[PDB]
Design an enzyme around this catalytic site. Structure first.
Site, PDB file in Angstrom:
ATOM      1  N   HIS A   1      43.685  37.654  33.099  1.00  0.00           N
ATOM      2  CA  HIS A   1      42.487  38.323  31.672  1.00  0.00           C
ATOM      3  C   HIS A   1      41.499  39.057  32.673  1.00  0.00           C
ATOM      4  O   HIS A   1      41.038  40.133  32.735  1.00  0.00           O
ATOM      5  CB  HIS A   1      42.291  37.850  30.547  1.00  0.00           C
ATOM      6  CG  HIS A   1      41.534  39.392  29.467  1.00  0.00           C
ATOM      7  ND1 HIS A   1      41.973  40.154  28.446  1.00  0.00           N
ATOM      8  CD2 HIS A   1      40.590  39.938  29.853  1.00  0.00           C
ATOM      9  CE1 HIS A   1      41.851  41.069  28.196  1.00  0.00           C
ATOM     10  NE2 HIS A   1      39.774  40.629  28.336  1.00  0.00           N
TER      11      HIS A   1
ATOM     12  N   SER B   1      43.515  39.574  50.651  1.00  0.00           N
ATOM     13  CA  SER B   1      43.431  40.606  51.066  1.00  0.00           C
ATOM     14  C   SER B   1      42.297  40.979  50.124  1.00  0.00           C
ATOM     15  O   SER B   1      41.070  41.377  50.356  1.00  0.00           O
ATOM     16  CB  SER B   1      43.938  41.614  51.430  1.00  0.00           C
ATOM     17  OG  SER B   1      44.244  43.434  50.945  1.00  0.00           O
ATOM     18  N   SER B   2      42.209  41.002  48.384  1.00  0.00           N
ATOM     19  CA  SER B   2      41.680  41.506  47.856  1.00  0.00           C
ATOM     20  C   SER B   2      39.959  40.372  47.617  1.00  0.00           C
ATOM     21  O   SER B   2      39.157  41.161  47.628  1.00  0.00           O
ATOM     22  CB  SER B   2      42.618  41.075  46.192  1.00  0.00           C
ATOM     23  OG  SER B   2      42.955  39.960  45.668  1.00  0.00           O
TER      24      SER B   2
ATOM     25  N   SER C   1      34.482  58.391  33.712  1.00  0.00           N
ATOM     26  CA  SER C   1      32.603  58.806  33.379  1.00  0.00           C
ATOM     27  C   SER C   1      32.139  59.500  34.420  1.00  0.00           C
ATOM     28  O   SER C   1      31.851  60.822  34.171  1.00  0.00           O
ATOM     29  CB  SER C   1      31.781  57.412  33.790  1.00  0.00           C
ATOM     30  OG  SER C   1      32.699  55.930  32.654  1.00  0.00           O
TER      31      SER C   1
ATOM     32  N   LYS D   1      31.945  51.418  24.878  1.00  0.00           N
ATOM     33  CA  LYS D   1      31.453  52.316  25.239  1.00  0.00           C
ATOM     34  C   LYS D   1      33.026  53.268  25.422  1.00  0.00           C
ATOM     35  O   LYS D   1      32.338  54.774  26.027  1.00  0.00           O
ATOM     36  CB  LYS D   1      33.002  51.752  27.165  1.00  0.00           C
ATOM     37  CG  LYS D   1      33.115  52.458  28.443  1.00  0.00           C
ATOM     38  CD  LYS D   1      31.917  52.982  28.635  1.00  0.00           C
ATOM     39  CE  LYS D   1      31.503  51.579  30.026  1.00  0.00           C
ATOM     40  NZ  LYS D   1      30.542  52.103  30.347  1.00  0.00           N
TER      41      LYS D   1
ATOM     42  N   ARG E   1      61.097  40.354  24.742  1.00  0.00           N
ATOM     43  CA  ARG E   1      61.546  40.704  26.323  1.00  0.00           C
ATOM     44  C   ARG E   1      62.115  40.386  26.567  1.00  0.00           C
ATOM     45  O   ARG E   1      63.001  39.332  27.039  1.00  0.00           O
ATOM     46  CB  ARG E   1      60.052  40.554  27.512  1.00  0.00           C
ATOM     47  CG  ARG E   1      59.175  42.029  26.631  1.00  0.00           C
ATOM     48  CD  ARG E   1      57.326  41.594  27.181  1.00  0.00           C
ATOM     49  NE  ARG E   1      57.112  41.155  28.105  1.00  0.00           N
ATOM     50  CZ  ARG E   1      56.344  40.707  28.027  1.00  0.00           C
ATOM     51  NH1 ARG E   1      55.024  40.000  27.649  1.00  0.00           N
ATOM     52  NH2 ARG E   1      55.840  40.649  29.921  1.00  0.00           N
TER      53      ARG E   1
ATOM     54  N   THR F   1      33.379  47.750  24.566  1.00  0.00           N
ATOM     55  CA  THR F   1      34.437  48.331  25.150  1.00  0.00           C
ATOM     56  C   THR F   1      34.717  49.711  24.478  1.00  0.00           C
ATOM     57  O   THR F   1      34.698  50.197  24.249  1.00  0.00           O
ATOM     58  CB  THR F   1      35.603  47.798  25.436  1.00  0.00           C
ATOM     59  OG1 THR F   1      35.419  46.622  26.168  1.00  0.00           O
ATOM     60  CG2 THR F   1      36.713  48.520  25.378  1.00  0.00           C
TER      61      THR F   1
ATOM     62  N   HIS G   1      58.779  45.703  39.354  1.00  0.00           N
ATOM     63  CA  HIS G   1      57.902  45.959  38.833  1.00  0.00           C
ATOM     64  C   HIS G   1      56.941  46.095  38.689  1.00  0.00           C
ATOM     65  O   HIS G   1      56.226  46.527  38.982  1.00  0.00           O
ATOM     66  CB  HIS G   1      58.976  46.925  37.516  1.00  0.00           C
ATOM     67  CG  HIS G   1      58.389  46.658  36.521  1.00  0.00           C
ATOM     68  ND1 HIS G   1      58.080  48.331  36.262  1.00  0.00           N
ATOM     69  CD2 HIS G   1      57.425  46.884  35.881  1.00  0.00           C
ATOM     70  CE1 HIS G   1      57.386  48.854  35.186  1.00  0.00           C
ATOM     71  NE2 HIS G   1      57.176  48.330  34.967  1.00  0.00           N
TER      72      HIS G   1
ATOM     73  N   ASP H   1      29.003  54.116  56.735  1.00  0.00           N
ATOM     74  CA  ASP H   1      29.831  53.264  56.222  1.00  0.00           C
ATOM     75  C   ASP H   1      29.695  52.196  55.413  1.00  0.00           C
ATOM     76  O   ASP H   1      28.534  51.385  55.202  1.00  0.00           O
ATOM     77  CB  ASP H   1      29.968  52.457  57.375  1.00  0.00           C
ATOM     78  CG  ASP H   1      29.908  53.657  59.248  1.00  0.00           C
ATOM     79  OD1 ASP H   1      30.777  54.706  58.571  1.00  0.00           O
ATOM     80  OD2 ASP H   1      29.826  53.439  60.264  1.00  0.00           O
TER      81      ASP H   1
ATOM     82  N   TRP I   1      56.801  38.633  35.777  1.00  0.00           N
ATOM     83  CA  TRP I   1      55.231  38.443  36.604  1.00  0.00           C
ATOM     84  C   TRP I   1      55.222  36.921  36.263  1.00  0.00           C
ATOM     85  O   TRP I   1      53.891  36.946  37.480  1.00  0.00           O
ATOM     86  CB  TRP I   1      54.380  39.858  35.669  1.00  0.00           C
ATOM     87  CG  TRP I   1      52.839  39.394  36.429  1.00  0.00           C
ATOM     88  CD1 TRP I   1      52.586  39.254  37.543  1.00  0.00           C
ATOM     89  CD2 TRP I   1      51.756  40.040  35.878  1.00  0.00           C
ATOM     90  NE1 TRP I   1      51.665  39.526  37.570  1.00  0.00           N
ATOM     91  CE2 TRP I   1      50.833  40.002  36.604  1.00  0.00           C
ATOM     92  CE3 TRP I   1      51.371  39.311  33.395  1.00  0.00           C
ATOM     93  CZ2 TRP I   1      49.589  40.219  36.314  1.00  0.00           C
ATOM     94  CZ3 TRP I   1      50.034  40.811  33.585  1.00  0.00           C
ATOM     95  CH2 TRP I   1      48.689  40.512  34.685  1.00  0.00           C
TER      96      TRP I   1
ATOM     97  N   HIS J   1      44.017  34.827  25.308  1.00  0.00           N
ATOM     98  CA  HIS J   1      44.679  35.035  24.136  1.00  0.00           C
ATOM     99  C   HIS J   1      46.518  35.509  24.229  1.00  0.00           C
ATOM    100  O   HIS J   1      47.030  35.620  23.245  1.00  0.00           O
ATOM    101  CB  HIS J   1      43.776  36.254  23.720  1.00  0.00           C
ATOM    102  CG  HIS J   1      43.388  37.148  24.855  1.00  0.00           C
ATOM    103  ND1 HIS J   1      42.540  37.648  26.009  1.00  0.00           N
ATOM    104  CD2 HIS J   1      44.060  38.617  25.083  1.00  0.00           C
ATOM    105  CE1 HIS J   1      42.572  37.959  26.625  1.00  0.00           C
ATOM    106  NE2 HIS J   1      44.385  38.758  26.424  1.00  0.00           N
ATOM    107  N   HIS J   2      46.234  35.994  25.727  1.00  0.00           N
ATOM    108  CA  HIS J   2      47.574  35.647  25.382  1.00  0.00           C
ATOM    109  C   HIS J   2      48.396  33.950  25.898  1.00  0.00           C
ATOM    110  O   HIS J   2      49.862  33.895  26.426  1.00  0.00           O
ATOM    111  CB  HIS J   2      47.883  35.640  27.257  1.00  0.00           C
ATOM    112  CG  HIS J   2      46.252  36.665  27.462  1.00  0.00           C
ATOM    113  ND1 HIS J   2      46.953  38.124  27.348  1.00  0.00           N
ATOM    114  CD2 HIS J   2      45.083  37.050  28.032  1.00  0.00           C
ATOM    115  CE1 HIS J   2      45.788  38.964  28.362  1.00  0.00           C
ATOM    116  NE2 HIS J   2      45.043  38.370  28.367  1.00  0.00           N
TER     117      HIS J   2
ATOM    118  N   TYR K   1      41.398  43.044  34.152  1.00  0.00           N
ATOM    119  CA  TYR K   1      39.600  43.915  34.266  1.00  0.00           C
ATOM    120  C   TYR K   1      39.357  44.582  35.478  1.00  0.00           C
ATOM    121  O   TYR K   1      38.085  45.230  35.075  1.00  0.00           O
ATOM    122  CB  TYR K   1      38.322  43.178  33.391  1.00  0.00           C
ATOM    123  CG  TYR K   1      38.539  42.616  31.816  1.00  0.00           C
ATOM    124  CD1 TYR K   1      38.700  44.080  31.454  1.00  0.00           C
ATOM    125  CD2 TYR K   1      39.456  42.084  30.612  1.00  0.00           C
ATOM    126  CE1 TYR K   1      38.967  44.377  29.818  1.00  0.00           C
ATOM    127  CE2 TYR K   1      38.958  41.894  29.846  1.00  0.00           C
ATOM    128  CZ  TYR K   1      39.507  42.441  29.167  1.00  0.00           C
ATOM    129  OH  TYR K   1      39.590  42.461  27.907  1.00  0.00           O
TER     130      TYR K   1
ATOM    131  N   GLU L   1      42.058  39.552  35.972  1.00  0.00           N
ATOM    132  CA  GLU L   1      42.825  40.419  36.804  1.00  0.00           C
ATOM    133  C   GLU L   1      42.325  41.509  36.057  1.00  0.00           C
ATOM    134  O   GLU L   1      43.125  43.094  36.881  1.00  0.00           O
ATOM    135  CB  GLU L   1      44.081  39.913  36.899  1.00  0.00           C
ATOM    136  CG  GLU L   1      44.240  40.542  38.644  1.00  0.00           C
ATOM    137  CD  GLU L   1      45.756  41.613  37.983  1.00  0.00           C
ATOM    138  OE1 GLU L   1      46.412  41.310  37.117  1.00  0.00           O
ATOM    139  OE2 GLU L   1      46.187  42.206  38.461  1.00  0.00           O
TER     140      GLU L   1
END
Ligand SMILES: CCCCCCCCCCCCCCCCCC(=O)OCC(COC(=O)CCCCCCCCCCCCCCCCC)OC(=O)CCCCCCCCCCCCCCCCC
Ligand code: HEA
Ligand code: HEA
Ligand SMILES: CCCCCCCCCCCCCCCCCC(=O)OC[C@H](COP(=O)(O)OCCN)OC(=O)CCCCCCCCCCCCCCCCC
Ligand SMILES: CCCCCCCCCCCCCCCCCC(=O)OC[C@H](COP(=O)(O)OCCN)OC(=O)CCCCCCCCCCCCCCCCC
Ligand SMILES: CCCCCCCCCCCCCCCCCC(=O)OC[C@H](COP(=O)(O)OCCN)OC(=O)CCCCCCCCCCCCCCCCC
Ligand SMILES: CCCCCCCCCCCCCCCCCC(=O)OC[C@H](COP(=O)(O)OCCN)OC(=O)CCCCCCCCCCCCCCCCC
Ligand SMILES: CCCCCCCCCCCCCCCCCC(=O)OC[C@H](COP(=O)(O)OCCN)OC(=O)CCCCCCCCCCCCCCCCC
Ligand SMILES: CCCCCCCCCCCCCCCCCC(=O)OC[C@H](COP(=O)(O)OCCN)OC(=O)CCCCCCCCCCCCCCCCC
Ligand code: CUA
Ligand SMILES: [Cu+2]
Ligand SMILES: [Mg+2]
Ligand code: NA
Ligand SMILES: [Zn+2]
Lengths: 514, 44, 49, 71, 227, 139, 62, 260, 104, 47
Positions: A240, A156-157, A255, A319, A438, A316, A61, A91, A126, A290-291, A244, A242
């Site tokens: 974190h 790839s990324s 926007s 924003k 969890r 944010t 998942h 291109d 995860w 913070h995690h 963002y 990843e």
């Protein structure tokens, strides 16, 4: 012809279409995985027997939605479809390594499916936290296959991020400055910078425990001087950032749709736009722990990290307030995309405020790895990123195909999605406040109520997915072409016709001399 | 975004057939599987 | 009058309303499922060992 | 005959008065949350801790004898 | 230890949990403050019918738009800094206890004197004596005296766990090769419950935690009488 | 084939005056209307007012601001499909869901409710606060 | 970048093309965050829809 | 002449897809050998990806230095992309350095609380790692001389500069193999041994990549491929080789000057 | 920015002798871009331009868009009637209220 | 240019027959939905 154009692709339009195809595939793979999860969580007791396969399906998942679904739509698909047609580029700079990243992603999908096929299964979540994914608890090829799938997705990324940064800082016509491009350009730029400076950290961590597994080393085994705290630091200094990456093209997409359908010729505070975006892109790294508040950190660095997250909450908030200001004061055409956008505004707001509530350190001591965190990232992903990409899909579909959807069906889809996610994940707020941890298959009587309610909401989301693919078929069957497109004077992607031709921007645009 | 009349217009019949088509087709997998989960469970 | 939403909108309003309230009342009450609704006020506990 | 009505900044005055309304309703629902739940917790804990005796409370939980340390 | 139709949190066992839910109520006041703000402004601008699509001027609101989040974020953060800085006073550790998280169960040892260790498991549903709790009852409870600070040394042996007692209001990650400190204080005798809160295998859901609060007199009575 | 390059017609409050007229092909009576437009203004009557308005502009604000019925249409079909999801729940309870655990019937919840009031779980506001221990009844 | 910044009526901004259609993007204010995109065809000189500078097409076949 | 922009035009190619599939075969060979001890799929993976990367770059050399689509703006983007890859590898290595620093700044309790852990005998950094620094710094200053001789235009001097820098790089690689044969313990031996063996061998993988890039740029220069200013192949070689110089310097000062 | 030369330059811009459909569309679209209800002399210059450029339909569109810009309150419009009445019957141009384009 | 372009035809799947196209979407997205079903039945057989 088919193999030479599609299987051997070199153009961003076709590569984006095949991104959208693979993203829909992985998206409903993840939907089915989440439905196994939630139907197991719908009944008290264990529906699927052991919860090892439950850990396997929650791992699948997380992997197939985070790394295989919305990054392929927003970053890959929408980026490659829009960005050349948004800066005036014919291109992109490096289309062969673009296509190699594309054609290497479904091999990572195949490795993940083969890891599911392995007898052991990827029972880790995860995170690939050792020594659960070590040589004693997961002795098998499933976790190793997940690690190489992460390797392939990372490669790839990274090469895609190189593609985006070179196609922004290169393919622009020369006289336009960087600080007047459209907002989705800034979103893809800052996300791709974050990709480029974040994915090596993940690759280092997964190679690190790869050598712990197969090369018989002890980087994470404390009997030989190892340190799982090192893996958590590496993984979430990826994580974190990843996050963002995972969220900012939603900023760009909503926007653009707001300044399209709100009657505006410009977003409000475009300097404020770009300043907030590079602020969160810059200090998104130094908020990584913070995690992390309950692994045994020092109190001083806990205070530093929670203060840094309060800091990253500030722009944010600028924003979202300026999103309110840019939708201020114009006629609002009641497009379905506006419904998605307003739902995104509300649900991103409440998810971010819930995230701040997590970000306070002692409440995170009490509420770690709990369904309150689940309600965080589902209020900001399962409807944040999801409503962002639904808005993007229902907005730019005539450019993608040449035909339009049905507005009534799309509004009904928004209603089904909205009601399903809210009365799913507000009971998840209640579950997290009540406090069950969890990755559990079965729950007691107190949690049964909200588990049943949110499971019924999950089946509402199933109905939503079915209606979505039905209206995709309905659009492709009715095949209503578009006579005219408004706001083409200010939108570059809409003025090449619906759909844009194969060879766009043969002559580069005539930029003003100034 | 304005659009010309449908090149092909689905009939109540066509819309019905299709909406149900996927609905059932997309859910049928779940059907066969979820239906015999206990049997599948049998190591036999 | 010529649009689809004039009469069929009210028709689908009534039909969907009746359909949803019937099916959801049947689901909430007529299966025999347990909502595990709170025992405050409604139960009479008895002494155990 | 009619006199001059407002020509300029109609939405402007509407928006300042309604953002002021936004602040007053936000503080109103904050006060609603406070008066609803917040000081009830403090006063309930307070009356519980004056009218509370741990020894007596353990005594009626241990007359039932539902403890691993009580027999 | 939770009740059906629970919308808030567990009632406190520890004073730190008491002012922590006071601070949590403050944060809830903040979240409905901001949520009502954005809802009413959205409702206002969807109920309007006036158009202003000119060039919006920008450099007029950013100072307020950055100082009001500045003040609200710092007055949320300074209670957070205070509570985090008082998590770690100079302890008066009257009692010590080590918890050693094993593969699919727990181990608890009292090791101040007359070295004692035991293993705590999951009571099966068919083996559940009537009236007890599914997924929370443990055949060997962990005892602690009330109204005292007791030190908690948490670690694990094969897979990382998280010793979680939300009723006491804490959650400590059990890591192999690494033990962390948690100071527990209680105000009420009786049972209090928790669980693992890290993924740890094919019985992750089935390692719960039970702490019963007894006095020091009954504590030493059990310690003497268990032999 | 080139209308995306040509100026095009639109009708919205954002764009009051479109750059091009709605009807470009012009019949002989419409050329008579245009030369009457270039002729005197005060001798021009109500009906030719309204067809010149309709041939130069497609729809007016009175027929562009109307509150239509798609909101109730989409909410009706949406909560219809929510009822269909309820039938999906009916089938899914009927077929895959087996028995509930035996710790859920009226007997077990009676004993466990008695036990959890006996141990006085969260008696401040959670559960046992709404119970009177002197009268042995709910508050 | 192009030269001959002169968008008057007597002289417009010359734009070279090999086709009959050609895109232009007006930065019609200094340090403007907005860019105004529109197509032109061979013939009369095209204009800007929010500032009114003029653009003309010339064919060059290379 | 239909392409009016000065950017790059690509005829569609099979080689990104075949390189992607070759990477998939590589990783399948890795799991097949790590779990079921089979080497055939791994050798297939190496053969596939090495050949495919060969004709991919063979295609880009054909389409660049004989056909001539590599506009100054195109190698401006190429130097952008090379800088991006370089800084990605900086943060890759820096993640490895910070893993080492986390392991070494706080020595765990089983290591005796001292760095290095007791009972092992790490090699002295006094002589042959100074030889490594000398040979790599000499190679770097030699390739700077090679770049300035590209500027000047002296072909035989460019030839000797390249021959001496490949000679130095291969001497580096064979000697670090020799003290891999001459080290007191293995990569499976302890946290400290594991981290510097993995880091130094991983740097060895980068320096053999860099040496092969120097081989291929030499064989281009013998075929008169590079010119006075369009010399981006050697620019990329110089940037990568200075990169491995400074990365070697960092891991040198850390591993050797820190705790020995 | 201020009111006096603001609506003065608007009146002169709409009353230029080299007026064209392009710049009347320009002026009215940038006028409705502002958060402004246009004043009677601006509308007078607009109908001067529409009179000298012969577009009854554009004049009716000006009336309809100020019908729209009247806002929720319907006292602005009739005020527009009472200070523009000599111009309407002077030119023979009339209102959507009389010509029946307020209904759907 | 040398490749035909237009609405619908720039997709990897042929568009002109809508019943057959519906068959393609049903088999494609249905196999996508039924994949994790096939995983979970595969370990339930395998366990
Ligand atoms: C070209 C001329 C016809 C050539 C033969 C077509 C049939 C066989 C084929 O090669 O078929 C082509 C293949 C292409 O599949 C792939 O390439 C695999 C990707 C993974 O089709 C599939 O396998 C199944 C596709 C099913 C329909 C998907 C609809 C997606 C709708 C939602 C996204 C809209 C995006 C709009 C933009
Ligand atoms: C879209 C993805 C996304 C986004 C944006 C965020 C955003 C944030 N996240 Fe989170 N997060 C995740 C995805 C995301 N997160 C995931 C996937 C996990 C867990 C993964 C796992 O467990 O395996 C996670 C976990 C996670 C934790 C770990 C809790 C735990 O498990 O123990 C924490 C705690 O600090 C956290 C915090 C935050 C914060 C503080 C923000 C902020 O950036 C939010 C900011 C947004 C706002 C909108 C700010 C609000 C401001 C206003 C509304 C303006 C007005 C208000 C004021 C001025 C006060 N996140
Ligand atoms: C992108 C990330 C993402 C998304 C969308 C979701 C979506 C959902 N998640 Fe997910 N979830 C996670 C990321 C995500 N989740 C993570 C990271 C975890 C933690 C794993 C761990 O513990 O390690 C988690 C955990 C998690 C759990 C906890 C399991 C456990 O630990 O015991 C549960 C259970 O309720 C759950 C439920 C759901 C539900 C019901 C949805 C629904 O919203 C599903 C509906 C959403 C969609 C269907 C997406 C829409 C897309 C399409 C319809 C196709 C796209 C195609 C085109 C656009 C063309 N999630
Ligand atoms: C490992 C995978 C390496 C892939 C690679 O290096 O591909 C070469 C790539 C393709 O060449 P490219 O510039 O994209 O071609 C279009 C214009 N010449 O070349 C480039 O894009 C230029 C250099 C990129 C280096 C990427 C390294 C990874
Ligand atoms: C019963 C299911 C088939 C219903 C077929 C039907 O009545 O179709 C008519 C109509 C088609 O949609 P229509 O209203 O014409 O277009 C909306 C414009 N945005 O259909 C609809 O508007 C949708 C009706 C859904 C009923 C459930
Ligand atoms: C007075 C001191 C105080 O604590 O006031 C609380 C609150 C204002 O709190 P303040 O810190 O100013 O800002 C909101 C959160 N930062 O002040 C209030 O909540 C005001 C309470 C009195 C007015 C209530 C009006 C209710 C209307 C319905
Ligand atoms: C959307 C709103 C913002 C996000 C809220 C997330 C947290 C949450 O749901 O909190 C529930 C809150 C606290 O629960 P509480 O009322 O204190 O329960 C104990 C006594 N009933 O409970 C409430 O606020 C009341 C119930 C939910 C109202 C919305
Ligand atoms: C539970 C949540 C259910 C949400 C369902 C939302 C359905 C929205 C349907 C819709 O947009 O209908 C359009 C209609 C207005 O139509 P229009 O003629 O453009 O406007 C005239 C005056 N508003 O009506 C509206 O725009 C009113 C409904 C707006 C809903 C916005 C929800 C934001 C979240
Ligand atoms: C790990 C794998 C990836 C390592 C990093 C690769 C970086 C590649 C950068 C390519 C940059 C590029 O595209 O440069 C442009 C250049 C063509 O332009 P240019 O030749 O400069 O100009 C014409 C001269 N008159 O094009 C080129 O120069 C393309 C060729 C560059 C690479 C040449 C080959 C290097 C091979 C190194 C790896 C060897 C692997 C096999 C051996 C080890 C096995 C373990
Ligand atoms: Cu231990 Cu989960
Ligand atoms: Cu985070
Ligand atoms: Mg954890
Ligand atoms: Na379950
Ligand atoms: Zn301009």
């Amino acid at each position: 012809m088919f193999i030479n154009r599609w299987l051997f692709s070199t153009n961003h339009k076709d590569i984006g279409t095949l991104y959208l195809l693979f993203g829909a595939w992985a998206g409903m793979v993840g939907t089915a995985l989440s439905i196994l999860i939630r139907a197991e969580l719908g009944q008290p007791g264990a529906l699927l027997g052991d919860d090892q396969i439950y850990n396997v399906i929650v791992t699948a998942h997380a992997f197939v939605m985070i790394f295989f679904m919305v990054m392929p739509m927003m970053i890959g698909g929408f980026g490659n479809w829009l960005v050349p047609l948004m800066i005036g580029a014919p291109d992109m700079a490096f289309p062969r390594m673009n296509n190699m990243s594309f054609w290497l992603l479904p091999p990572s999908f195949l490795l993940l499916l083969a890891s599911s096929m392995v007898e052991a299964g990827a029972g880790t979540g995860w995170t690939v936290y050792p020594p659960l994914a070590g040589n004693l608890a997961h002795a098998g090829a499933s976790v190793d296959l997940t690690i190489f799938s992460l390797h392939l997705a990372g490669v790839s990324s990274i090469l895609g991020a190189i593609n985006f940064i070179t196609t922004i800082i290169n393919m622009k016509p020369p006289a336009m400055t960087q600080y007047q491009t459209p907002l989705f350009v800034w979103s893809v730029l800052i996300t791709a910078v974050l990709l480029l400076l974040s994915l090596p950290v993940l690759a280092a961590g997964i190679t690190m425990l790869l050598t712990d597994r197969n090369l018989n080393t002890t980087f994470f085994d404390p009997a030989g001087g190892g340190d799982p705290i090192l893996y958590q630091h590496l993984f979430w200094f990826f994580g974190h950032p990843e996050v963002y990456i995972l969220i900012l093209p939603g900023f760009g997409i909503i926007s653009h749709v707001v300044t399209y359908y709100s009657g505006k010729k410009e977003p409000f505070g475009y300097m404020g736009m770009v300043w907030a975006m590079m602020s969160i892109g810059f200090l998104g790294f130094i908020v990584w722990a913070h995690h992390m508040f309950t692994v045994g950190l020092d109190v001083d660095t806990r205070a530093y990290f929670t203060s840094a997250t309060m800091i990253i909450a500030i722009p944010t908030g600028v924003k979202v307030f300026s999103w309110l200001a840019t939708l201020h004061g114009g006629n609002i055409k009641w497009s379905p995309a506006m419904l998605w956008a307003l739902g995104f505004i509300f649900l991103f707001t409440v998810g971010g405020l819930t995230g701040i509530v997590l970000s306070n350190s002692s409440l995170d001591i009490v509420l770690h790895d709990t369904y309150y965190v689940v309600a965080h990232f589902h209020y900001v992903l399962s409807m944040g990123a999801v409503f962002a990409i639904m808005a993007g899909f229902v907005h730019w579909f005539p450019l993608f195909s040449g035909f339009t959807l049905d507005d009534t069906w799309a509004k009904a889809h928004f209603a089904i999605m909205f009601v399903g996610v809210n009365m799913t994940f507000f009971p998840q707020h209640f579950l997290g406040l009540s406090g069950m941890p969890r990755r559990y298959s079965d729950y007691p009587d107190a949690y049964t109520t909200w588990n049943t309610v949110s499971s019924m909401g999950s089946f509402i989301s199933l109905t939503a997915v079915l209606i979505m693919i039905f209206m995709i078929w309905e659009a492709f069957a009715s095949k209503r072409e578009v006579m005219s497109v408004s706001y083409a004077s200010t939108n570059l992607e809409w003025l090449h016709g619906c759909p844009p031709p194969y060879h766009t921007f043969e002559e580069p645009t005539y930029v003003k001399v100034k | 975004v304005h659009s010309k009349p449908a090149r092909e217009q689905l009939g109540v019949l066509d819309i019905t057939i299709g909406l149900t088509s996927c609905f059932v087709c997309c859910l049928l997998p779940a059907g066969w599987v979820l239906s015999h989960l206990e049997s599948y469970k049998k190591r036999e | 009058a010529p649009s689809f939403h004039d009469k069929y909108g009210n028709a689908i309003l009534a039909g969907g309303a009746i359909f949803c309230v019937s099916t959801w009342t049947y689901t909430a009450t007529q299966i025999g499922i347990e909502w595990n609704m709170s025992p405050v006020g409604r139960v009479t506990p008895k002494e155990w060992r | 005959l009619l006199p001059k009505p407002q020509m300029r900044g109609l939405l402007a005055k509407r928006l300042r008065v309604h953002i002021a309304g936004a602040f007053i309703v936000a503080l109103g629902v904050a006060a609603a949350y406070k008066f609803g739940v917040a000081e009830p917790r403090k006063k309930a804990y307070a009356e519980f801790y004056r009218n509370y005796d741990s020894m007596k409370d353990f005594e009626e939980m241990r007359k039932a004898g539902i403890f691993q340390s009580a027999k | 230890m939770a009740y059906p139709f629970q919308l808030g949190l567990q009632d406190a066992t520890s004073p730190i949990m008491e002012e922590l839910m006071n601070f949590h109520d403050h944060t809830l006041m903040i979240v409905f403050l901001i949520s009502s703000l954005v809802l009413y402004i959205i409702s206002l601008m969807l109920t309007t019918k006036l158009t202003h699509t000119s060039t919006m001027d920008a450099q007029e609101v950013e100072t307020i738009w950055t100082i009001l989040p500045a003040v609200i974020l710092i007055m949320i953060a300074l209670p957070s800094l205070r509570i985090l800085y008082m998590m770690d006073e100079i302890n008066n550790p009257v009692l010590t206890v080590k918890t050693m998280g094993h593969q699919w169960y727990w181990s608890y040892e009292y090791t101040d004197y007359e070295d004692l260790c035991f293993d705590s498991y999951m009571i099966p549903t068919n083996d559940l004596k009537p009236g007890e709790l599914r997924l929370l009852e443990v055949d060997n409870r962990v005892v602690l005296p009330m109204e005292l600070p007791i030190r908690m040394l948490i670690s694990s042996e094969d897979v990382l766990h998280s010793w979680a007692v939300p009723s006491l209001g804490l959650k400590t990650d059990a890591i192999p090769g690494r033990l962390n400190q948690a100071t527990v204080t209680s105000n009420r005798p009786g049972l209090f419950y928790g669980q693992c809160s890290e993924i740890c295998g094919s019985n992750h859901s089935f390692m719960p935690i039970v702490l019963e609060m007894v006095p020091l007199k009954y504590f030493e009575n059990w310690s003497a009488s268990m032999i | 084939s080139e209308d995306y390059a040509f100026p095009t017609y639109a009708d919205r409050r954002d764009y009051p005056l479109p750059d091009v007229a709605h009807v470009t092909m012009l019949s002989a009576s419409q050329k008579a209307l245009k030369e009457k437009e270039k002729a005197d203004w005060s001798s021009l009557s109500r009906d030719e007012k309204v067809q010149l308005y309709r041939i130069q502009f497609n729809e007016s604000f009175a027929e562009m601001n109307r509150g239509t019925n798609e909101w109730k249409t989409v909410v009706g079909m949406a909560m219809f499909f929510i009822g269909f999801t309820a039938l999906v729940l009916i089938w899914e309870k009927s077929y895959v869901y087996g028995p509930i655990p035996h710790t859920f019937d009226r007997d077990w919840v009676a004993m466990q409710t008695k036990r959890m009031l006996d141990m006085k779980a969260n008696p401040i506001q959670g559960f046992s606060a709404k119970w009177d221990y002197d009268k042995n009844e709910w508050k | 970048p192009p030269k001959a910044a002169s968008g008057t009526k007597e002289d417009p901004n010359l734009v070279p093309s090999i086709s009959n259609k050609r895109i232009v993007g007006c930065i019609c204010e200094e340090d403007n965050c907005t860019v105004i995109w529109f197509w032109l065809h061979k013939g009369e000189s095209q204009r800007c829809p929010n500032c009114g500078t003029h653009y003309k097409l010339v064919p060059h076949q290379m | 002449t239909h392409q009016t922009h000065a950017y790059h035009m690509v005829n569609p190619s099979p080689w990104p897809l075949t390189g992607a599939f070759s990477a998939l075969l590589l990783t399948s060979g890795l799991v097949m050998w790590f779990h079921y001890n089979s080497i055939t799929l791994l050798t297939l993976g190496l053969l596939t990806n090495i050949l495919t990367m060969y004709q991919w770059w063979r295609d880009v050399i054909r389409e660049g230095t004989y056909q001539g689509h590599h506009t100054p703006i195109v190698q401006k983007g190429l130097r952008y992309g090379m800088i991006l890859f370089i800084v990605s590898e900086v943060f890759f290595f820096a993640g490895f350095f910070w893993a080492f620093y986390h392991s070494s700044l706080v020595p765990t309790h089983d290591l005796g609380g001292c760095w290095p852990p007791t009972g092992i005998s790490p090699l002295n950094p006094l002589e042959v790692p100074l030889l490594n620094t000398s040979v790599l710094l000499a190679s770097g200053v030699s390739i700077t001389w090679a770049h300035h001789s590209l500027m000047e235009g002296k072909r035989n001097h460019m030839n000797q500069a390249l021959l001496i820098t490949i000679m130095l790089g291969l001497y580096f690689t064979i000697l670090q193999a020799s003290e891999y044969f001459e080290t007191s313990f293995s990569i499976s031996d302890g946290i400290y041994g594991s981290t510097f063996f993995m880091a130094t061998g991983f740097h060895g993988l980068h320096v053999i990549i860099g040496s092969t890039f120097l081989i291929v740029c030499l064989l281009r220069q013998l075929k008169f491929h590079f010119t006075s200013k369009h010399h981006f192949g050697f620019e990329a070689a110089a940037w990568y080789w200075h990169f491995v110089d400074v990365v070697w310097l960092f891991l040198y000062v850390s591993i050797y000057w820190w705790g020995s | 920015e201020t009111d006096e030369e603001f609506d003065a330059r608007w009146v002169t811009y709409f009353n230029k002798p080299d007026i064209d459909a392009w710049e009347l569309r320009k002026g009215m679209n940038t006028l409705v871009g502002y958060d402004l209800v246009p004043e009677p002399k601006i509308i007078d210059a607009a109908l001067r331009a529409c009179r000298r450029l012969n577009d009854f339909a554009s004049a009716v569109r000006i009336l309809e868009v100020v019908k729209d810009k009247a806002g929720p309150h319907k006292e602005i419009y009739p005020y527009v009637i009472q200070e523009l009445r000599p111009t309407l019957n002077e030119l023979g141009i009339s209102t959507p209220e009389e010509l029946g384009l307020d209904k759907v | 240019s040398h490749y035909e372009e237009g609405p619908g035809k720039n997709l990897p799947f042929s568009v002109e027959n809508k019943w057959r196209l519906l068959a393609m979407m049903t088999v494609y997205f249905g196999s996508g939905f039924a994949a994790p079903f096939f995983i979970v039945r595969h370990q339930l057989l395998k366990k």
